[PDB]
């Protein structure tokens, strides 16, 4: 019994993402924190933050149980606030859950960079990629370069033998690289070939995976990738991390955004967990739900794991004790 969201026409891709973001408590706690986060003594009062508060308003309502029976909320109050930022939706290619996620995450960062004297905390989807290069003839490395991400946007690999595609294969295809053939070394003082390491250095608490299922064909038409990618409820990232030590990172599923159909009958939808606050506001549930705009329905886990994922909202956990 989570509230639905009204969709008339053009606004399903937002609803599906909202239902996803609402499944990540750390994002709601960051917003509860962020919107209340101020610094004493500073003489300049802080700049206001309509987006952070409008987004918390909705996600807090989708996070708790319904209050009025089968209630359906209206998130058009959010659409107006985003237009106060640069976002002007101008093509059908932009009616997308991932695109919006990157519009939202950028517009939150505008608000962190808005009030500058008071310290605002960095959002829990933030992580870093690291690139590094090692030479084969001397076994030594360059100093690293860093990079940032809000989502690991995995391109889908093409088939070779015909084994099932796994999320591990779409990740290792992305977090990996080739060798360069002509540039000099330092330890070998003079022309050389070295290996391009790509790994992730900072891991966010809320991990957004993205499967590039929607792209443009050879001659510009919308191309959809239909093949299924196998994923699990718990996911371990210890093989993609830079620091070479025995500490462990483990993530647990919170929501799966899914794209059904295409063009005329294309649609976004969300699998997500039921609210935890069953008088026990800390106990993350194991009953899954299927939400399509104003429609809410129970769903088993085998229903989630069989669906064709578009966005996966993983959240970090310490141990697998469920």
């Amino acid at each position, epitope marked *: 019994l989570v509230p639905g969201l009204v969709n008339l026409g053009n606004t399903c891709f937002m609803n599906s993402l909202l239902q996803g973001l609402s499944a990540c408590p750390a994002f709601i706690r960051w917003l509860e924190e962020f919107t209340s986060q101020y610094s004493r003594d500073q003489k300049e009062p802080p700049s206001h933050q309509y987006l952070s508060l409008t987004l918390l308003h909705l996600l807090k309502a989708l996070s708790c149980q319904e209050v009025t029976d089968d209630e359906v909320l209206d998130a058009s109050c959010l659409l107006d606030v985003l237009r106060m930022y640069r976002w002007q939706i101008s093509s059908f290619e932009e009616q997308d859950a991932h695109e919006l996620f990157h519009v939202i995450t950028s517009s939150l960062e505008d608000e962190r960079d808005g009030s500058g004297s008071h310290w605002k905390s960095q959002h829990p989807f933030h992580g870093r990629l690291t690139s590094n290069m090692v030479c084969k003839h001397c076994e030594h490395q360059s100093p690293v370069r860093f990079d940032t991400f809000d989502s690991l946007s995995l391109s889908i690999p093409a088939a*070779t*033998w015909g084994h099932p595609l796994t999320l591990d*294969h779409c990740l*290792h295809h992305f977090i*990996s690289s080739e060798s360069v053939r002509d540039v000099v070394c330092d330890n070998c003082t003079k022309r050389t070939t070295f290996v391009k390491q790509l790994k992730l250095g900072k891991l966010p608490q809320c991990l957004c995976i993205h499967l590039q299922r929607l792209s443009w064909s050879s001659h510009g038409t919308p191309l959809k990738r239909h093949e299924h990618v196998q994923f699990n409820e718990d996911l371990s990232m210890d*093989e993609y991390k830079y620091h070479s030590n025995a500490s462990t990172y483990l993530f647990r599923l919170m929501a799966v955004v899914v794209h059904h159909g295409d063009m005329h009958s294309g649609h976004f939808v969300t699998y997500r967990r039921s609210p935890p606050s069953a008088r026990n506001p800390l106990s993350t549930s194991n009953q899954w739900l299927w939400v399509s705009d104003d429609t809410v329905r129970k769903a088993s886990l085998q229903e989630v794991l069989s669906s064709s994922a578009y966005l996966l909202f993983y959240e970090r956990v310490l141990e697998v004790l469920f």
Partner: antibody, heavy 116, light 108 residues
Framework: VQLQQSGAELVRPGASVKLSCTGSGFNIKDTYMHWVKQRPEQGLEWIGRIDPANGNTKYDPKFQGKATMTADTSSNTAYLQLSSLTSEDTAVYYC??????????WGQGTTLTVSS | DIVMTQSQKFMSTSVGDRVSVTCKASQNVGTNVAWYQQKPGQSPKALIYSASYRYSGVPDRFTGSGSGTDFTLTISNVQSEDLAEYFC?????????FGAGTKLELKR
């Protein structure tokens, strides 16, 4: 649900041969499908993948000038055609067809032999 | 091309034992290694498709592990059914390549 192959054969060096496969479940062009070469010392080697919905296959570049591939759908016969045999071109040839739930389907082997 | 070094042609085990045949690849192949089984006179059987994932009809005795370059197939509580040839196979790149094949035997 088997994937039967053609019986074995024997030829002199310098000749050419062609093999066959067919199974008791369709999706023939609705899947990828492979041929591999097994001889005891060197071992298993992959030679190519067929795209039976069409026919512009991918070969191993150490085979392309010596192995060629075709197939048919309404009659489920996928073929292999290889040429200019030496006695070194003797091996058991398997044709394989992937599946996602079960382990991928393999056929009863075809044991090409070549000598003077 | 890419090749996988298998550790031996031959490994010795007990019944009810734990055994670990391995593969080492020429370059980073991600998670894209598959493990196969072949008993004399038979066609091969697929055991594990990603580095760790089991097919249907495969006992919990079999587990796969590894990433990038060093990979392992482990059989625990080895049964008398598990005396066969074991290959590993890449599907990261074209051409697809195997190992040499490892036979298993009861020590005595």
């Amino acid at each position: 649900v088997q994937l039967q192959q053609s019986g074995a054969e024997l030829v002199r060096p310098g000749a050419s041969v062609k093999l066959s496969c067919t199974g008791s479940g369709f999706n023939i062009k609705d899947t990828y499908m492979h041929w591999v070469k097994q001889r005891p010392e060197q071992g298993l080697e992959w030679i190519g993948r067929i795209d039976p919905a069409n026919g512009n296959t991918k070969y191993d570049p150490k085979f392309q000038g010596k192995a060629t591939m075709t197939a048919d759908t309404s009659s489920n016969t996928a073929y292999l055609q290889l040429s200019s045999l030496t006695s070194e071109d003797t091996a058991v040839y398997y044709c394989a067809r992937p599946d996602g739930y079960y382990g991928d389907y393999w056929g009863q082997g075809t044991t090409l032999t070549v000598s003077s | 091309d890419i090749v996988m070094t298998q550790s031996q042609k031959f490994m010795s085990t007990s019944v009810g034992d734990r055994v670990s045949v391995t593969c080492k690849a020429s370059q980073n192949v991600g998670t894209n290694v598959a493990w196969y089984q072949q008993k004399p006179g038979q066609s091969p059987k697929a055991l594990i498709y990603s580095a760790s994932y089991r097919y249907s009809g495969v006992p919990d005795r079999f587990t796969g592990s590894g990433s990038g370059t060093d990979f392992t197939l482990t059989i625990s509580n080895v049964q008398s059914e598990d005396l066969a040839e074991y290959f590993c196979q890449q599907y990261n790149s074209f051409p697809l390549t195997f190992g040499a094949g490892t036979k298993l035997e009861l020590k005595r």
